Design an enzyme around this catalytic site. Structure first.
Site, PDB file in Angstrom:
ATOM      1  N   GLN A  21     -31.958  30.014  -8.706  1.00 39.67           N
ATOM      2  CA  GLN A  21     -32.523  29.167  -9.742  1.00 39.67           C
ATOM      3  C   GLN A  21     -33.938  28.690  -9.421  1.00 39.67           C
ATOM      4  O   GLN A  21     -34.675  28.352 -10.336  1.00 39.67           O
ATOM      5  CB  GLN A  21     -31.591  28.007 -10.053  1.00 39.67           C
ATOM      6  CG  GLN A  21     -30.261  28.499 -10.574  1.00 39.67           C
ATOM      7  CD  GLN A  21     -29.323  27.373 -10.901  1.00 39.67           C
ATOM      8  OE1 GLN A  21     -28.519  26.985 -10.065  1.00 39.67           O
ATOM      9  NE2 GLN A  21     -29.415  26.846 -12.109  1.00 39.67           N
ATOM     10  N   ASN A 168     -19.938  27.780  -4.646  1.00 36.69           N
ATOM     11  CA  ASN A 168     -20.271  26.848  -5.719  1.00 36.69           C
ATOM     12  C   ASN A 168     -19.636  27.312  -7.031  1.00 36.69           C
ATOM     13  O   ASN A 168     -19.922  28.413  -7.515  1.00 36.69           O
ATOM     14  CB  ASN A 168     -21.783  26.759  -5.922  1.00 36.69           C
ATOM     15  CG  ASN A 168     -22.151  25.840  -7.063  1.00 36.69           C
ATOM     16  OD1 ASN A 168     -22.253  24.630  -6.878  1.00 36.69           O
ATOM     17  ND2 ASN A 168     -22.333  26.403  -8.253  1.00 36.69           N
ATOM     18  N   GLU A 169     -18.815  26.436  -7.609  1.00 34.11           N
ATOM     19  CA  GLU A 169     -18.180  26.640  -8.917  1.00 34.11           C
ATOM     20  C   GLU A 169     -17.600  28.036  -9.140  1.00 34.11           C
ATOM     21  O   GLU A 169     -17.861  28.659 -10.166  1.00 34.11           O
ATOM     22  CB  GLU A 169     -19.159  26.294 -10.047  1.00 34.11           C
ATOM     23  CG  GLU A 169     -19.687  24.872 -10.003  1.00 34.11           C
ATOM     24  CD  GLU A 169     -20.490  24.488 -11.232  1.00 34.11           C
ATOM     25  OE1 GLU A 169     -20.733  25.341 -12.098  1.00 34.11           O
ATOM     26  OE2 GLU A 169     -20.897  23.322 -11.331  1.00 34.11           O
ATOM     27  N   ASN A 310     -18.605  18.829  -8.488  1.00 31.87           N
ATOM     28  CA  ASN A 310     -19.687  18.988  -9.466  1.00 31.87           C
ATOM     29  C   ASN A 310     -19.151  18.422 -10.777  1.00 31.87           C
ATOM     30  O   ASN A 310     -18.451  19.123 -11.528  1.00 31.87           O
ATOM     31  CB  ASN A 310     -20.086  20.461  -9.630  1.00 31.87           C
ATOM     32  CG  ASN A 310     -20.953  20.977  -8.487  1.00 31.87           C
ATOM     33  OD1 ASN A 310     -21.177  20.290  -7.483  1.00 31.87           O
ATOM     34  ND2 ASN A 310     -21.472  22.189  -8.651  1.00 31.87           N
ATOM     35  N   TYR A 312     -20.056  16.619 -14.356  1.00 33.08           N
ATOM     36  CA  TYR A 312     -21.036  16.301 -15.383  1.00 33.08           C
ATOM     37  C   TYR A 312     -20.473  15.612 -16.628  1.00 33.08           C
ATOM     38  O   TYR A 312     -21.116  14.718 -17.166  1.00 33.08           O
ATOM     39  CB  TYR A 312     -21.706  17.579 -15.829  1.00 33.08           C
ATOM     40  CG  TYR A 312     -22.608  18.224 -14.799  1.00 33.08           C
ATOM     41  CD1 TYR A 312     -22.116  19.136 -13.870  1.00 33.08           C
ATOM     42  CD2 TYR A 312     -23.973  17.954 -14.789  1.00 33.08           C
ATOM     43  CE1 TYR A 312     -22.963  19.764 -12.954  1.00 33.08           C
ATOM     44  CE2 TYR A 312     -24.827  18.579 -13.889  1.00 33.08           C
ATOM     45  CZ  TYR A 312     -24.325  19.483 -12.974  1.00 33.08           C
ATOM     46  OH  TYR A 312     -25.194  20.106 -12.111  1.00 33.08           O
ATOM     47  N   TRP A 432     -28.342  16.905  -9.552  1.00 30.32           N
ATOM     48  CA  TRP A 432     -28.822  18.188 -10.032  1.00 30.32           C
ATOM     49  C   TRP A 432     -29.876  17.853 -11.108  1.00 30.32           C
ATOM     50  O   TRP A 432     -29.503  17.335 -12.164  1.00 30.32           O
ATOM     51  CB  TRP A 432     -27.694  19.056 -10.642  1.00 30.32           C
ATOM     52  CG  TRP A 432     -28.256  20.378 -11.016  1.00 30.32           C
ATOM     53  CD1 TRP A 432     -28.903  20.694 -12.164  1.00 30.32           C
ATOM     54  CD2 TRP A 432     -28.351  21.526 -10.170  1.00 30.32           C
ATOM     55  NE1 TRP A 432     -29.383  21.970 -12.104  1.00 30.32           N
ATOM     56  CE2 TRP A 432     -29.040  22.517 -10.895  1.00 30.32           C
ATOM     57  CE3 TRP A 432     -27.889  21.821  -8.886  1.00 30.32           C
ATOM     58  CZ2 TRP A 432     -29.285  23.786 -10.372  1.00 30.32           C
ATOM     59  CZ3 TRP A 432     -28.108  23.069  -8.373  1.00 30.32           C
ATOM     60  CH2 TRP A 432     -28.817  24.042  -9.105  1.00 30.32           C
ATOM     61  N   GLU A 439     -31.830  27.847 -15.618  1.00 29.48           N
ATOM     62  CA  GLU A 439     -30.465  27.409 -15.908  1.00 29.48           C
ATOM     63  C   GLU A 439     -29.609  28.555 -16.463  1.00 29.48           C
ATOM     64  O   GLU A 439     -29.093  28.485 -17.581  1.00 29.48           O
ATOM     65  CB  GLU A 439     -30.484  26.181 -16.837  1.00 29.48           C
ATOM     66  CG  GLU A 439     -29.139  25.495 -17.089  1.00 29.48           C
ATOM     67  CD  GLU A 439     -28.278  25.307 -15.844  1.00 29.48           C
ATOM     68  OE1 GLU A 439     -28.819  24.996 -14.764  1.00 29.48           O
ATOM     69  OE2 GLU A 439     -27.038  25.440 -15.949  1.00 29.48           O
ATOM     70  N   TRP A 440     -29.440  29.587 -15.638  1.00 32.40           N
ATOM     71  CA  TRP A 440     -28.520  30.705 -15.914  1.00 32.40           C
ATOM     72  C   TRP A 440     -28.729  31.270 -17.328  1.00 32.40           C
ATOM     73  O   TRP A 440     -29.856  31.663 -17.649  1.00 32.40           O
ATOM     74  CB  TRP A 440     -27.083  30.267 -15.622  1.00 32.40           C
ATOM     75  CG  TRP A 440     -26.947  29.730 -14.211  1.00 32.40           C
ATOM     76  CD1 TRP A 440     -26.637  28.450 -13.870  1.00 32.40           C
ATOM     77  CD2 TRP A 440     -27.188  30.427 -12.976  1.00 32.40           C
ATOM     78  NE1 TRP A 440     -26.634  28.305 -12.505  1.00 32.40           N
ATOM     79  CE2 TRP A 440     -26.983  29.499 -11.931  1.00 32.40           C
ATOM     80  CE3 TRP A 440     -27.555  31.742 -12.649  1.00 32.40           C
ATOM     81  CZ2 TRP A 440     -27.100  29.848 -10.578  1.00 32.40           C
ATOM     82  CZ3 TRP A 440     -27.678  32.089 -11.309  1.00 32.40           C
ATOM     83  CH2 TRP A 440     -27.459  31.138 -10.287  1.00 32.40           C
ATOM     84  N   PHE A 448     -33.296  20.177 -16.079  1.00 32.42           N
ATOM     85  CA  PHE A 448     -32.460  19.204 -15.376  1.00 32.42           C
ATOM     86  C   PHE A 448     -33.220  18.382 -14.326  1.00 32.42           C
ATOM     87  O   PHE A 448     -32.628  17.527 -13.668  1.00 32.42           O
ATOM     88  CB  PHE A 448     -31.316  19.952 -14.643  1.00 32.42           C
ATOM     89  CG  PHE A 448     -30.062  20.172 -15.461  1.00 32.42           C
ATOM     90  CD1 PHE A 448     -29.092  19.185 -15.555  1.00 32.42           C
ATOM     91  CD2 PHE A 448     -29.797  21.417 -16.048  1.00 32.42           C
ATOM     92  CE1 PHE A 448     -27.907  19.403 -16.261  1.00 32.42           C
ATOM     93  CE2 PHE A 448     -28.618  21.636 -16.745  1.00 32.42           C
ATOM     94  CZ  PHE A 448     -27.664  20.631 -16.849  1.00 32.42           C
TER      95      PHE A 448
END
Length: 475
Positions: A21, A168-169, A310, A312, A432, A439-440, A448
Site C-alpha cells: 500500500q 493480516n486479515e 482490526n 473499524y 490506520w 486502498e486495494w 485513511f
C-alpha cells in the site's frame, strides 16, 4: 474528552501501514512481481485503474515518514514485510540481500527514535511465483514457503523486533480471493460469480484458510523452538473484526449474529487457541472444513501470543437459515445477511468506505467478545481508522480539514479506554494509517491518512487528525 493517561503507562500507540500500500519501487532491489503487482496491471479491478507501482514511494521516503510519526509522539509502528523483497523466488531461490538491507534500515531508523517495530509478515501479498508454481494457498507446500520466509525474517530482524504478526486479515483475503473472486487469485463459482480462471466458492476458501492457519502454526513453532528464548518477542495474528448486532432482537437473529461472528475471527482463532474450527462453522460446513492431522495439532499447541484486532465498524445481522436471502454474499454459508440499516436507517453515521459506520461502542463489544471466547488472551488494536472520499474533496485543504476523523478517533479511543478499565487485556492501539495510501480495490479514492499525500509531488502534509493525535499523545 479522552487522554493518554486514561490508558496504561506501557500501552503502545502507533500507526499502521502495509508494504504494497505504501512502498512503490515495485521492481527495485531485485524484488519479484507479487500477486498484487500482477493483479493491478490487469483491467477491471481497481476502481480508479491505479496500482501500487509507486504508491507513497516509501521505499525512498521512509526516513521522512519515520520523522513524521516521531513528531506525533508514537512509541510503535506497525508495518509489513514484502515477501517478494526477501525471497523473490520463494524458499529455494535464495535470500535477497537488498530486501534484508531495506528492512534493517527501516527498523534501525524507527528504533533510533524510540519507536518499537510491530511487524506483519504477510499482508495480502505473495510472490506471484508461488501462485504460478503450485497455486499458493491451495497447496500445503505454502506452509513450508511461509515457514522459511518467517525463519529468515526472525533470524535477520528478531534481535530488534519484539512483536510479530503472521497474517493480516486472512478472513478478508481468503474470502475475497477464493469465494467472491474479487482479490487475486480471482477464483470463484456460482452463485458468487463467474470467474474465468475457475474455482469453487464452497470448497477453495476453506482449503486456503486451512493452509493459512497451518502456515501460522509452522511459523510460531519455528519462533518458539529457535528464537523466543533469545529474542523474547510475541507472535500473533491479525483478524478483520467487525462487531455484529441482531437486526431484530429475537432468537433467530441473535443466533444468526453469533454465526456471523463465529464465521469471521474464530474461523482462524478457534484452531489457534482450542485446536479445532468453531463448532458453529463445523455444524454447518462439516467436511468442507479440512481436518488437523497429528503433525498439525503438534504445531497448533504453540497457539498464538496475542490477537490483532482490526476493528473499524459494526453492522446488523439477520437470519437466513429460516428465511430466503439473496445468494452470493460472503456471509452466505454462515446463513446470515448483514446490513448497516434497520428500517432503512443507518446504525451510525455513514462514511466513504462501504460498510464502515461510526459506531464507537463496537470496539468495546468486539473486545468483550474476544475476552469471553478466548479467556482474555492479550490483544492489540492493530488497526482502527476512518476514510475520506468523494466529490466533497477538490483540493488539499478539504482533505486536511478532517474533524470527521477526529470525532471518529476520539469516540473509539473513549470506548477502548472503557473496555480496558473493565478488565480487557488490550496492550496497544494503531491508527490506520499514518499516510494516505493505495486502498486495494478502491485505489487512491479512499484516504485513511493522518497525513495527506499529494501523489504528483509526494508531499506529506498533516491533516487536523495528525495534530489531534499528537496532542492526544502529549497528554
Amino acid at each position: 474528552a479522552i487522554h493518554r493517561s486514561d490508558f496504561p503507562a506501557s500501552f503502545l500507540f502507533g500507526t499502521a501501514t502495509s508494504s504494497y500500500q505504501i512502498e512503490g519501487a515495485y521492481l527495485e532491489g531485485n524484488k519479484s512481481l507479487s500477486n498484487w503487482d500482477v493483479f493491478t496491471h490487469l483491467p477491471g479491478n481497481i476502481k480508479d485503474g491505479s496500482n501500487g507501482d509507486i504508491a507513497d514511494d516509501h521505499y525512498h521516503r521512509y526516513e521522512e515518514d519515520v520523522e513524521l510519526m516521531n513528531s506525533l509522539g508514537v512509541n510503535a509502528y506497525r508495518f509489513s514485510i514484502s515477501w517478494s523483497r526477501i525471497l523473490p523466488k520463494g524458499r529455494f531461490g535464495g535470500v535477497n540481500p537488498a530486501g534484508i538491507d531495506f528492512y534493517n534500515k527501516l527498523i534501525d531508523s524507527i528504533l533510533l527514535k524510540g519507536i518499537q517495530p510491530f511487524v506483519t509478515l504477510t499482508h495480502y501479498d505473495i510472490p506471484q511465483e508461488l501462485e504460478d508454481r503450485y497455486g499458493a494457498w491451495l497447496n500445503a507446500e505454502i506452509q513450508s514457503d511461509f515457514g522459511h520466509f518467517a525463519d529468515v525474517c526472525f533470524g535477520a530482524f528478531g534481535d530488534r523486533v519484539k512483536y510479530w504478526t503472521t497474517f493480516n486479515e486472512p478472513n478478508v483475503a481468503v474470502r475475497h480471493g477464493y469465494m467472491l473472486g474479487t482479490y487475486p487469485p480471482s477464483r470463484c463459482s456460482p452463485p458468487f460469480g463467474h470467474c474465468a480462471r475457475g474455482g469453487d466458492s464452497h470448497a477453495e476458501p476453506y482449503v486456503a484458510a486451512h493452509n493459512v492457519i497451518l502456515s501460522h502454526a509452522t511459523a510460531i513453532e519455528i519462533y518458539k523452538r529457535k528464537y523466543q528464548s533469545k529474542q523474547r518477542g510475541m507472535i500473533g495474528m491479525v483478524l478483520y473484526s467487525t462487531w455484529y448486532e441482531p437486526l431484530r432482537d429475537v432468537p433467530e437473529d441473535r443466533l444468526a449474529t453469533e454465526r456471523a461472528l463465529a464465521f469471521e475471527t474464530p474461523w482462524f482463532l478457534d484452531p489457534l487457541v482450542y485446536g479445532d474450527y468453531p463448532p458453529e462453522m463445523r455444524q454447518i460446513l462439516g467436511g468442507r472444513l479440512p481436518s488437523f492431522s497429528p503433525e498439525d495439532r503438534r504445531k497448533l499447541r504453540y497457539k498464538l501470543d496475542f490477537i490483532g484486532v482490526n476493528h473499524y465498524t459494526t453492522l446488523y445481522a439477520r437470519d437466513c437459515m429460516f428465511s430466503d436471502c439473496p445468494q452470493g454474499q460472503e456471509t452466505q454459508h454462515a446463513l446470515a445477511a448483514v446490513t448497516g440499516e434497520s428500517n432503512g436507517l443507518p446504525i451510525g453515521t455513514p462514511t466513504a468506505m462501504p460498510t464502515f459506520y461510526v459506531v464507537p461502542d463496537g470496539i468495546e463489544k468486539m473486545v468483550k467478545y474476544f475476552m469471553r471466547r478466548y479467556n482474555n488472551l492479550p490483544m492489540f488494536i492493530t488497526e482502527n481508522g476512518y476514510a475520506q472520499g468523494g466529490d466533497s474533496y477538490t483540493d488539499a485543504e478539504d482533505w486536511i480539514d478532517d474533524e470527521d476523523r477526529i470525532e471518529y478517533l476520539e469516540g473509539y479511543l473513549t470506548k477502548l479506554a472503557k473496555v480496558i478499565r473493565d478488565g480487557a487485556d488490550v496492550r496497544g492501539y494503531f491508527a490506520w494509517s499514518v499516510v494516505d495510501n493505495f486502498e486495494w480495490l478502491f485505489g487512491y479514492t479512499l484516504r485513511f491518512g493522518l497525513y495527506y499525500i499529494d501523489y504528483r509531488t509526494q508531499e506529506r502534509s498533516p491533516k487536523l487528525s495528525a495534530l489531534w493525535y499528537k496532542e492526544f499523545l502529549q497528554n
